[PDB]
Amino acid sequence: TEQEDVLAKELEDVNKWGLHVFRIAELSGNRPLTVIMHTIFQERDLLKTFKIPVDTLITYLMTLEDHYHADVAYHNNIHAADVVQSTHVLLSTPALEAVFTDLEILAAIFASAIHDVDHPGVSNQFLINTNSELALMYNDSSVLENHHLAVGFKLLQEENCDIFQNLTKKQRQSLRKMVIDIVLATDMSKHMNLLADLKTMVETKKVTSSGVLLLDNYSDRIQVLQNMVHCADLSNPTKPLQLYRQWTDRIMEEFFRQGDRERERGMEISPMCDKHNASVEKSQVGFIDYIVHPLWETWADLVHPDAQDILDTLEDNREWYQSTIP
Template sequence: MLYLKFNKDISKQELNLIEKKFKQYSKETITPEFNVLNLSRTDVYAHVLSIFVRVNVHGILKVSVSQLLDFLIDVAEKYTEAPYHTFYHAADIVTMLYYLCHDLSANKYLTDLDITFLMVAALCHDMGHPGYNNTFQINTKTDLALRYGDGSILESYSVDLTIELIKKHKLDKKHKEMNEILTDLIISTDMAYHPKLQEEANQLFNTWSKLTTTNKNDFPSGDRLSLSRILLHTADISNTARPWTISKQWSDLIVKEIYNQGDEEKKRKLTISAGMDREVCSQKSITLKFADIILPFFESLVSLLPKSHVLVDFLASNRIQWECLELAKKRRVSSDIIIQPSNITFKRIRLGFRSQSYPTVFTDSAVLSLESILEDTDSDLFKDFATYLHQSYCIENLGFWLATQEYYQECSNRKELCQSMINLYIRANSTQEINIPCDMRQSILDDYNSENYHLHIFDDAAEAVLELMRVNSFLPWTTSSCSPPTCWPSPKKLVQSNSLTLSNSFSFSDKWNLIKLKQPSLSRKSCSSLDYIHHDSNNDRLDLSDNNNLFSVHSASTTTTTSGTRYRSMLKRVKKSILGNNQEDHFITPRSSFTADDTTSTWSSWRKSLR
């Protein structure tokens, strides 16, 4: 049972909830797709605590889990409410560090004590950050600038706050060198040290490539500290090298903080810092310029940790997403309808923040998205869309999706409802069988046959069906030339519900396409915003130009596919796309790049290229 010595304002009920969540997050798989911004404050405490316990921070520092939580909460209280530099940023860095150490094998070079110091530094590295950078502190002659001089002002402030809390909680009683190492690590997070850290990464590779030992204790302590700096910096700047939806969300927060500083500088009649004038610099230009700066660093990291090429892949694919996002804004489907990425988060559907890349139709007077249609089942738009589904012989998708919404709210007769849905939608050759991969279907049936009627049994299938409706039906429907019928045949569905509210704990799997692409027999397929179709044929070309043939496919004869392409070929394609090179070559197309008229004309040919 958890007990807090200092944070007495945390109620017993909250502590019990943290403990319960802690046990859940201890079993959670940590990947770059893990998004801390989807968590409540209680969940964040539990999540970070679970990572600290996984790497045995409490054991190394000789403290209890309760003492660790007490320290963690005190650290959180020292963070400000700046748009980006919050405790959530710190939690995200801790998360990525665990991924770097555990999944990308950095821990084979570091001792448990090294990792302990690294985790504590990550947690504390931006404490007290006011949301205005070191340059602003100097130019406005703040108290912090007067106290710490012209060097790493905010980092030095974070160091002082860290040491203060370390002493308060007596975390350094067994390791007297702790404060010195934490100081070194936190100061190194200043972007001014970025070139130096890249050089250190190259030097480490040259040194370690000549070593024959595999014992981490044989690596010099100076080299291990250098690697710790590199890993902390990697995690700190990794938001640009994450899956698109997470990267975009962090970018929103960063740009908000940047623009706030530019506005304050303008208000004080100071020279606006480079890249901080909202009237001059777009979010895309800010993000991509930063990506250009950090790309060589991540390439150097690949030399040290070959598995980290996945981060470079994310950098490359996100660049394409930004380019496509800008082009999509210019893409006019008709005189009064434009397809654009949605800025609306449909909170009733637990899709994280993926909706930021979902297609939305802007008319003269309203914003129309698939989520907004499904939200109101009594509206004429919903009925017209359902009619379109019925006419295109895929009304079972809507029926199943509505049935899942009812299932999430049902408590008393979940077993009976699950059985009805299985018989109507899931079993092969059922009356309204939905089109999902065999693996997914079998997984649902296995749970059902073992009488495991849990809340999330239909999660993956629900997202799969939603994506099918989005790509195969919603976009074609928005540009359909036929007049919408005034009434529509009632689909034979299991339930009818006006409430689409889901459980707060509902979470969809982002790996639907990884499963789906293995099913060559499917007649309908979709691409999620995180998956890419790779064309490897000299006869295929995707034109990236702002004209009526945008994103069209030519001579789609023979194509092959791949996912997780190697980083260098990815960068080559990115470079060509940015330079406007339309030569026949490799190219990667995000799902959100498809516009409505392209979808209807090219989907069948694209489908054949999927594995």
């Protein structure tokens, strides 16, 4: 019961950026996604609002967590838990207070939880290039993301797993559509278009008399949620360095494993997947300069000045990785 109290102590930081998710993973017996999701649902009073039976929630979460691969270095249950918790913090930003309904909040969090379920540890391009069964099923379009959604929803049909059993038909219909729109937007090939639209929104931003963001149509509302989860998905470089470095170690291991498979297939090794010609530090600086910072700088503007500290950490981490190059 002592380890349980230690876990509870750690979960007290659920509303903070930089929570130590790896520690929670260890303290929870490798159930970070289940405990963090359960904690967040209680924190947001979602069980009461949507009449979700506690046993049903725990059963679904354990089943969902089970469908993430424990043998994939990065795209596993810890990453899912991290994206869920990061999205949870972003949803609480002052600039968005009272903006989203409980159903939209539920959608964003659920989407985050299932967004990478059953990820094999290889990219969409690798699956397409190897004529995989998955790419055949999904016609080379958002292959993995379509699969994550299919699995996430299908698991709700398992014994005592339908956590949405008490939502109205209309609520279920709306939630399913929002979750699909959000997870499909996590396809990295859509990053540029997603960012392009986010920039357009910031340039034409409008706030209410309360000072919060004004979103009066589905298009704008779902666009903000899509970008929110995408930011959470790309939040590793914005976290305290000891967390960021572990995430980098994990994605590189995953990349190298894919590279070994590509080499063993006589295929041209994907970028940053060749362990015999890798520049980890220079690659992280590039990742931040061309993808992560442009995105976070834009999000920071949308919710200014709410994300200033997050942006400052990202810039400090960029500076640090750069310093390891000279």
